[PDB]
Design a binder for these strands. Structure first.
Lengths: 139, 158, 144, 49, 114, 56, 99
RNA sequence: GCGAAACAGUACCGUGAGGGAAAGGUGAAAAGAACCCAGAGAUGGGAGUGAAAUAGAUUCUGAAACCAUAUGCCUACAACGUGUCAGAGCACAUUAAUGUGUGAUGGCGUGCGUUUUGAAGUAUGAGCCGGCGAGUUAUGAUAGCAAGCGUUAGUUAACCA
RNA sequence: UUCUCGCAGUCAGACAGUGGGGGAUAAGCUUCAUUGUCAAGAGGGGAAGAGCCCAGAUCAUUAAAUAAGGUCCCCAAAAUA
RNA sequence: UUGUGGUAGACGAGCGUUGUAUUGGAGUUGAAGUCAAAGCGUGAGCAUUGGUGGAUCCAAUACAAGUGAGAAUGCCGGCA
């Protein structure tokens, strides 16, 4: 159950995006769409459109319930920001940065879909332990 | 080196009122701009003195090893003929003479064209003349087919 | 190679005791309270397994001090402000708080350790013998 | 003694590189004390001095 | 003859990083500071291999002396009693473990009677 | 003023922790199909049921 | 019931059905060794050293102590001498008794 | 490595002499993600392509430091370069290994160079990571080791093949 | 510790005692001769530590007997008169 | 038997890296480089396993080293 929706480089600081989206992580979309359409934040429309596209993809492209989906995790990645020079007093200058962001949010259907990650990590370390065991099995 | 790179000698920084290192040059060997004084030097001799007496003693020892190696069976001038450049029959000969893997060296003093047109397609076989054979080349083969005229000349040379 | 020492873990027990202060003098009662709480009297002492028990001290006010000491050595407490030193004598503390005085003495007598603050509050000190702390069925362990 | 096996007889004696290494000397002092004139580049004044 | 030579240094730094782990945040990811903390921990280890060996003796002596004074006789007089008659060599830790196995320290305390 | 040393990330995150944002107050808007934030107007332009102002 | 043995310079109070590590005493794996420098087995003690008292033990493996990294250094004076330490030992257990 | 693997002495700097950078990599063949969904679109998601889409044109690769979130644990009366050894408690089960992961608490613990009489220092240096970064060679000499020759030896320099 | 050969560093030291020079027979003062220490070497006692006292370390060991010093409690060891 | 502190400083004995000479091996059944793991090491270092990865590398001996990185208020790139 991935239901992700990547964004790839809208110009906004992810520092504020994380801060605004703790309030929606782990909760459904019906109670979140109204509040995001009403919250006074710049990234509100962005995240609302992203989650709408994610829901549309989940229902159409894959096909799931919808009544039990909720935000699995926040992440607002730090891609290449852009550097510009600004002049100041006494013929001095500073070299300021303008931030961009990658936005991708997964949607989960059950109270689960976390533990199997640990299960498969344990599996890939097990296949290592049998691999190591077979090393000494040479005769 | 320092003066071998292009660049005007001058301080980009003022010697005072700067918190960075001294940096009294635009280019400095600890930059990537160059100035390296430790690199490839094209002035070595690439030669070491070796006396002819010790070299001749080494030749005597290596030919003694060759005669004692026993894998130096004799060949004749007439056998170097009978082919133009046909290595395939020569290859069948050499595999019938149990040499395929180890290098094979030919000694000669007459410069037969039949052998030189052959044995010049494979790295495992090569001919060389007594005046030009070196100790490394002798021990590069471990498998030599010796001609009959080098014997008396080598004995008299000592 | 292994002679590993054995100490109990997660095992604890604290009892109620009764001790007098009529003939006692501050130093000896203080050392006995300190090594009682501090575990210096248990065959199975463990530095981090509740070495302390519960103590009740009764009638501290009639403690005897060697004369002029009561007005010779002065007990000072500094506040956060300048001139914050409030200075008291033995006769003053004997009528206001000597239980706090022996409290201070045993706390300065005990190691300054993270557990010693929990050790130091294990003792209930009163100038009388009619209070609630006597309803826990204590034991008459005096001169201990 | 072949190209597959070549060992000399007691050669390659003790070498000294003063630019690298710090666990066996030859570091910054490089076995010649400290604050000497010879520490500066092109030391070793004229033997007649 | 130019050689980049980057793998050996990064392998050595990986080894230095792996020397210690679980440190206080930035320490377990700061190469030079991690090396210095590893050196300080080695100093701790040596100094402790001294101190703990010298302090086990004190701990055993105290834990015996507590019971012994609860039996009525001091530790030093006990050592003298051993010395003057029936010199029994024993570890102070083993006299501790004799208490942990009860009903047996009684044999010692009856044997100490000369 | 300037500190002699760089600030640890732990005070960065711990001090920023107070910047946690409260949630919005909502209501129930019945005639207009909206879950309107409390004591404001809805997307239909109806505040407490009145078409005071045109939708568009 | 129990015994006290002296291995190296250390005493060991060992009861029955107990396994333990001691110093390497040149014992092959799986062999039986009678230990004699013992004291206080069970109402049995000798004044200087206990006499006519032994204890059976069976070795099960040889091991090396945990590799400690002793890096002894003098700071600001360039001393950095490093060494790694593993100490041999033997893991063994008693069997029934012997006296 | 020529400054310059590219439209390089280019951009750019000064008004001018002069100064003066950086950046390459698709797949096998683009067949370069056709068709559908959402959105204004970029784009994303399906689907398809293709051996592979951790091959998607963001393209040979993708460590560190940098920024996040979560498995299991601890932590909101506490004087600490935050670690060692002991140590429960908890959660587990490996390069079967005197098991691992965190560590309530006890015992103790004033950085690394630098130069220095002597620095834990309020002397200096370091924000971090990565890369780079400073005893070579020529002609000789000195001494040692090793080898060769050998008491009218030995060596050839330059030079020729 | 004498001889030869090679490689050096070392001439900005400090502390204390013993006796001195100056000074105020003043200074953790300077300069000295001897003695030891630190530099160049840590530990235990002095609460703290380069020079003081006992000291002169391959490493490890859940061992014992001692030196200076210490044994009402912090903090480990005793009492008797 | 003597030891086995140790600055500067002297000695001895070593490890690792690049490539040339050769033997030898391995290699889409997956080289290098990579991260991850709960090894071996007296130390310079040497493994093993599993996934990324997509095509050379290593074992042994010599030779020549743009041959050994934590500091230079070092230089660059990115990041605070």
């Amino acid at each position: 159950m991935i239901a992700f929706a990547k964004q790839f480089r809208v110009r906004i600081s992810p520092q504020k995006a994380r801060l605004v989206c703790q309030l929606i992580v782990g909760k459904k979309t019906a109670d979140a769409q109204n509040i995001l359409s009403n919250t006074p934040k710049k990234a509100a429309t962005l995240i609302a459109k992203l989650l709408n596209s994610a829901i549309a993809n989940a229902t159409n492209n894959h096909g799931m319930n919808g009544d039990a989906l909720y935000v699995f995790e926040c992440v607002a990645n730090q891609g290449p920001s852009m550097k510009r020079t600004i002049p100041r007093a006494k013929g001095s200058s500073n070299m300021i940065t303008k931030r961009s962001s990658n936005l991708v949010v997964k949607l989960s259907d059950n109270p689960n879909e976390r533990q199997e990650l640990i299960k498969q990590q344990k599996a890939l370390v097990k296949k290592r332990v049998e691999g190591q065991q077979k090393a000494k099995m040479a005769r | 080196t320092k003066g071998e790179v292009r660049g005007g000698g001058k301080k980009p920084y003022k010697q005072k009122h700067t918190g960075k290192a001294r940096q009294g040059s635009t280019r400095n060997p600890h930059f990537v701009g160059g100035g390296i004084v430790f690199g490839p030097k094209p002035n070595r001799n690439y030669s070491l003195k070796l006396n002819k007496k010790a070299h001749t003693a080494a030749l005597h020892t290596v030919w003694s090893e060759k005669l004692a190696s026993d894998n130096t069976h004799l060949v004749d001038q007439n056998l170097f003929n009978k082919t133009e450049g046909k290595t395939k029959v020569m290859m069948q000969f050499l595999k019938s003479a149990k040499l395929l893997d180890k290098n094979v060296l030919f000694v000669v003093n007459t410069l037969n064209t039949n052998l030189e047109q052959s044995t010049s397609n494979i790295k495992n076989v090569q001919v060389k003349h007594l005046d030009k054979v070196s100790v490394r080349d002798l021990m590069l083969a471990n498998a030599l087919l010796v001609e009959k005229e080098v014997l008396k000349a080598l004995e008299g040379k000592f | 190679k292994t002679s590993m020492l054995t100490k109990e873990q997660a095992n604890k027990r604290r009892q109620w005791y009764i001790v007098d202060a009529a003939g006692l003098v501050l130093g000896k009662l203080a050392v006995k309270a300190a090594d009682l709480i501090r575990g210096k009297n248990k065959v199975d002492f463990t530095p981090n397994q509740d070495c302390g028990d519960y103590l009740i001290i009764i009638n501290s006010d009639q403690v005897v001090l060697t004369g002029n000491k009561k007005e010779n050595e002065f007990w000072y407490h500094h506040s956060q402000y300048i001139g914050g030193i409030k200075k008291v004598s033995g006769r003053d503390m004997l009528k206001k708080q000597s239980d706090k005085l022996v409290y201070n003495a045993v706390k300065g007598m005990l190691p300054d350790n993270r557990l010693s603050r929990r050790w130091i509050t294990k003792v209930h000190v009163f100038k009388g013998d009619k209070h609630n702390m006597e309803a826990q069925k204590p034991t008459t362990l005096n001169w201990s | 003694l072949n190209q597959l096996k070549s060992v000399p007889k007691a050669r390659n004696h003790k070498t000294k590189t003063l630019g690298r290494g710090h666990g066996s000397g030859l570091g910054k002092t490089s076995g010649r004390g400290q604050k000497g004139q010879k520490a500066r580049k092109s030391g070793l004044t004229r033997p007649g001095f | 003859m130019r050689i980049k030579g980057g793998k050996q240094t990064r392998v050595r730094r990986k080894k230095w990083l792996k020397q210690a782990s679980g440190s206080f945040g930035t320490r377990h990811a700061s190469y030079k500071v991690a090396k210095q903390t590893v050196i300080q921990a080695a100093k701790y280890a040596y100094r402790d291999r001294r101190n703990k060996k010298r302090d086990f003796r004190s701990l055993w002596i105290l834990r015996l002396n507590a019971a012994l004074r609860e039996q009525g006789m001091t530790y030093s007089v006990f050592i003298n009693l051993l010395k003057k008659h029936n010199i029994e060599i024993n570890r102070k830790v083993l006299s501790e473990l004799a208490i942990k196995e009860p009903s047996k320290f009684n044999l010692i305390v009856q044997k100490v009677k000369s | 003023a300037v500190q002699q040393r760089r600030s640890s990330k732990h005070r960065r995150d711990k001090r920023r922790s107070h910047d946690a944002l409260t949630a919005q107050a909502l209501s129930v808007c019945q005639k207009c199909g909206k879950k309107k934030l409390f004591h404001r107007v809805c997307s239909c332009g109806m505040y407490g049921d009145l078409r005071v102002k045109k939708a568009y | 019931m129990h015994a006290i043995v002296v291995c190296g310079s250390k005493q060991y109070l060992v009861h029955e059905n107990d396994t333990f590590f001691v110093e390497k005493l040149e014992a092959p794996v799986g062999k039986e060794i009678q230990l004699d420098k013992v004291l206080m087995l069970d109402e049995k003690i000798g004044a200087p050293y206990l006499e006519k008292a032994r204890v059976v033990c069976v070795v099960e493996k040889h091991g090396l102590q945990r590799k400690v990294n002793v890096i002894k250094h003098i700071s600001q004076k360039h001393h950095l001498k490093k060494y790694g330490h593993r100490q041999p030992y033997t893991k063994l257990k008693v069997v029934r008794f012997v006296h």
